[PDB]
Design a protein around this ligand. Structure first.
Ligand SMILES: [Zn+2]
Ligand SMILES: [Zn+2]
Lengths: 451, 155, 20, 145, 48
């Protein structure tokens, strides 16, 4: 019973993990279909879909149900495909911080970071390194901060105090056989570790995005228009639009500072017009109906920011002809300066900030390609030295200093054994455990070593 | 086994003589291979890495080249199976270490997700990555990649 | 009615900075 | 084929002027700036369509008494009383208006919307005809470089 | 033009030394040679 249901739930979770991106694209296509059939609405205070010969009203409801179901499937497949990786990274970082910096021992974190304060209730649990492919971190930190601080003062906040005491006691002739009772694993599972894991998940941004996605999909049933918010996933989701959206999101701060400077310039022009131009803002309709004047600072500022910017020809085309004396020249100067400073050299800045980002990204890509084609990633010697033997550099980068080969070697060291390493393997393993990396060839290779 | 034109007359008669043929003329080829290929693979890989080490650390030796001429028949089977790293071992000595590469690893290394992750890593390391911590972040990338490869393999 | 009350309600928060 | 159809109608000879572009290589320096990205331009117009659709559904759900393009008075038509009609009106008028969409609709002088519709129109302007045509122009300017 | 100025400043600071101006390649024979040379031997802060 328990085994036959666990072996089935594991297979279901594995399927949901294998089909995360496929369900993602399917949800995108369902949102597209929903938004395409949303193009057939009419008003009567009552929104009605009477645009076809049936087969369009119930299909919208079933498709909304399907979209909610597939959004739930996506949010539960993310939890099985990507959360292990982020919790692995978190555990790795916090364990290495504990070991090499003494965070929760000598270097207590400040209040300006929430991760340093939330990673405190995980160092004192039983299964702290759940995904770090080793468990010898508590022993390392105990041996490192054993005499210089309290031998028991360390284990009290690193946990396993009573556990280690009982283990040292049971090392003698006292050891029972632990029993396993079905339907009684709630006491065995760790609740504090799950508290910490759920906190990390709810702080993860990529999960909050899917949470908002499912929330909008659910609200789509209360109103069949929140499915329009699912089209934002073509931009905030898949990476088919990054080449275009990167030109906008590259500067960002420059664009917002540009619109701020534009607001300030429009405010200066507004106060000038408010103090020196009265008989001009007279947008009367049919005659003898004066309103929308500049008789108010806020109203004049809104009129400026809303009409003079979008007028396409400055502000002189939206106000009376400046034919009166004493202002014939002053207001011509005013209007031509507004034109040349607001919609000529202040929209040119906004467009230049978008046009320069393309060139900056292209230059980044070209520099990446040049650094990959000119030097080696590991030793960094140069192309000219290896280009003495026919096709020397490519053979050097594909056989001697292959990044894939180095990754496979690290994987082999990690997953092989601890007591079966050879001399070189034990050497590299010790250097990797102390995190020094002097075994990587710095500026030498097997060809520079010999003839 | 004779239509593939790989086994000669001697090899065919040898593989026929090494059959179980326990009075019924039936062979459990499952156990046959699991018995006659499982340790043969390990010993052949050891011989292959030995010969590769000898060839790469003793070139311009025709007496060994003639032996490699006849050893290439088994050396090619272990071509996508042995790696080579150039590490700094003894003081100022670039030592070439060899090791085995699992087919599961060399399968999940070519997935588009892993390749795109490696591309993005190289990109944002060449662009804004430093020099003192280049290996520091490269080992982190390797650890993340092997973790996600283990995850994708155990599914 | 929020065209004029919006800016006043926005400035109503900076009284805590004006007092200090 | 077009040259033969030119006898059935003496206007298919206008299709032969496309040979100055799809034929000889005297215009490649200019047309390469357009055909270099191509995919970027079509994805840009797709993103523009999506943004206009979002603005359309917002206006359809929150702006009723504004789309009143009546002629001579008391003749209301071309309103936003239909999703497809409102979307076509947006994509056809608000994009080419040169000043967003606030110059093609009624003055937002009514209460409860004086500020919401000003925000709507200025955001449409700053996002559709300011930083979405700048992208189309930047994709042509970067190809030269 | 400003971006190109910034990139040229960064390149001249990462390729040569400010005082002697020898080059990165010569000092890049000892593991992490150029950064040690620019942080210990020819430090502008040290000269100041
Ligand atoms: Zn190299
Ligand atoms: Zn120097």
């Amino acid at each position: 019973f328990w085994k036959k249901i666990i072996a089935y739930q594991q297979k279901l979770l594995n399927y949901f993990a294998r089909n995360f991106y496929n369900m993602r694209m399917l949800a995108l296509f369902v949102a597209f279909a929903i938004n395409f059939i949303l193009l057939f609405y009419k008003v009567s205070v009552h929104y009605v879909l009477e645009e076809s010969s049936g087969y369009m009203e119930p299909t919208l409801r079933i498709l909304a149900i399907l979209h909610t179901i597939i959004s739930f499937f996506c949010i539960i497949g993310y939890y099985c495909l990507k959360v292990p990786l982020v919790i692995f990274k978190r555990e790795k970082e916090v364990a290495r911080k504990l070991e090499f910096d003494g965070l929760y021992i000598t270097e207590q974190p400040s209040e300006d970071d929430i991760k340093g304060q939330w990673d405190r209730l995980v160092i004192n649990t039983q299964s702290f390194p759940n995904n770090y492919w080793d468990k010898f971190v508590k022993r390392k930190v105990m041996d490192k901060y054993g005499e210089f601080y309290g031998r028991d003062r360390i284990s009290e906040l690193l946990g396993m105090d009573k556990a280690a005491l009982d283990f040292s006691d049971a090392r003698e002739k006292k050891k029972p056989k632990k029993d396993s009772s079905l339907s009684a694993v709630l006491n065995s599972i760790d609740v504090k570790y799950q508290m910490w894991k759920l906190g990390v998940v709810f702080t993860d941004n990529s999960f909050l995005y899917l949470a908002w996605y499912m929330t909008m999909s659910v609200l789509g049933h209360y109103n069949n228009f929140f499915f329009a918010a699912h089209l934002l996933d073509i931009a905030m989701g898949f990476k088919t639009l990054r080449t275009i959206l990167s030109s906008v999101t590259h500067n960002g701060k420059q664009l917002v500072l540009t619109v701020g400077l534009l607001a300030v310039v429009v405010y200066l022009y507004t106060v000038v017009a408010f103090n020196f131009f009265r008989k001009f803002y007279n947008k009367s309709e049919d005659g003898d109906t004066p309103d929308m004047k500049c008789d108010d600072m806020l109203t004049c500022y809104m009129f400026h920011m809303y009409v003079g910017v979008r007028a396409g020809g400055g502000i002189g085309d939206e106000i009376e002809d400046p034919a009166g004396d004493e202002y014939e020249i002053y207001r011509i100067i005013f209007d031509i300066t507004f034109f040349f400073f607001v919609i000529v050299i202040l929209l040119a800045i906004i467009q230049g900030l978008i046009i320069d980002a393309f060139g900056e990204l292209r230059d980044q890509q070209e520099q990446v390609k040049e650094d990959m084609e000119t030097k080696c990633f590991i030793c960094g010697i140069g192309n000219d030295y290896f280009d003495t033997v026919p096709h020397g550099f490519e053979t050097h980068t594909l056989q001697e200093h292959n990044l894939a080969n180095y990754l496979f070697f690290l994987m082999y060291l990690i997953n092989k054994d601890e007591t079966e390493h050879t001399g070189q393997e034990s050497y590299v393993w010790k250097m990797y455990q102390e995190r020094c990396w002097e075994f990587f060839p710095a500026g030498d290779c097997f060809r520079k070593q010999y003839e | 086994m004779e239509s593939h034109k790989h086994y000669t007359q001697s090899e065919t008669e040898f593989l026929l003589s090494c059959a179980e043929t326990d009075e019924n003329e039936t062979l459990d080829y499952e156990e046959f291979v699991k018995r006659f290929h499982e340790p043969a693979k390990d010993i052949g890989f050891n011989v292959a890495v030995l010969l590769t080490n000898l060839s790469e650390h003793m070139p311009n030796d025709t007496r060994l080249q003639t032996f490699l001429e006849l050893a290439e028949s088994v050396l090619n089977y272990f071509q996508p199976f042995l790696g080579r790293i150039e590490i700094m071992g003894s003081a100022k000595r670039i030592e070439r270490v060899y090791f085995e590469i699992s087919e599961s690893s060399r399968t999940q290394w070519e997935k588009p997700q892993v390749k795109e992750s490696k591309r993005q890593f190289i990109f944002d390391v060449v662009n804004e990555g430093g020099e003192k911590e280049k290996m520091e972040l490269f080992v982190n990338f390797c650890e993340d990649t092997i973790f996600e490869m283990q995850l994708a393999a155990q599914i | 009615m929020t065209v004029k009350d919006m800016v006043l309600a926005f400035f109503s928060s900076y009284w805590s900075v004006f007092v200090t």
